[PDB]
Design a protein around this ligand. Structure first.
Ligand SMILES: Nc1nc(=O)c2nc(CNc3ccc(C(=O)N[C@@H](CCC(=O)O)C(=O)O)cc3)cnc2[nH]1
Length: 159
């Protein structure tokens, strides 16, 4: 089963690590718990953004150029990446944008963190049809002494 996961700001916008205008430890936990002991696929830009294999998960880099680092698995295509994954119950796609769109049509599920914040960004998560997706979980949180902004966790299943 293929899965997508992201953090979005107002208007489907998605941003970089250092760009991360927000500060939500809670979202991170959420993400870790939803990716742990699972494979994660990602673009090179994200590779780069992160700087180190993410521990406890199989890190696969989807990219057109040859790899530049033995700690990870470099893939040249959607198909190649899914194959490298082997038989697992869930594949978590983590971006970037191009990444997202390339797999959405394959996804069966979505993990989204809705963040109450307006920001200028380049990229957007792919416009996904809400009538095709069914909301199976939600949980809203007000900002707090650790969480800089209000947020909502949401999981959707493809009807
Ligand atoms: N919901 C959601 N939130 C995100 O922040 C997110 N980030 C990416 C891409 N960027 C990143 C950047 C850093 C780390 C990182 O260190 N992750 C640690 C959590 C570390 C902590 O608590 O400091 C991990 O082990 O997963 C993960 C993804 C993709 N989907 C996301 N999805």
């Amino acid at each position: 089963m293929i899965s997508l996961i992201a953090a979005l700001a107002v208007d489907r916008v998605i941003g970089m690590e250092n760009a991360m205008p927000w500060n939500l430890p809670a979202d991170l936990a959420w993400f870790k718990r939803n990716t742990l002991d699972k494979p994660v696929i990602m673009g090179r830009h994200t590779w780069e953004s992160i700087g180190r294999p993410l521990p406890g998960r199989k890190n696969i880099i989807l990219s057109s150029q040859p790899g530049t680092d033995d700690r990870v698995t470099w893939v040249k295509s959607v198909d190649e990446a899914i194959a490298a994954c082997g038989d697992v119950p869930e594949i978590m796609v983590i971006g970037g944008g191009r990444v997202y769109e390339q797999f959405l049509p394959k996804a069966q599920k979505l993990y989204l963190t809705h963040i109450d914040a307006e920001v200028e960004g380049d990229t957007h998560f792919p416009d996904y049809e809400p009538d095709d997706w069914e909301s199976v979980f939600s949980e809203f949180h007000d900002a707090d002494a650790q969480n800089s902004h209000s947020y909502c966790f949401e999981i959707l299943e493809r009807r």
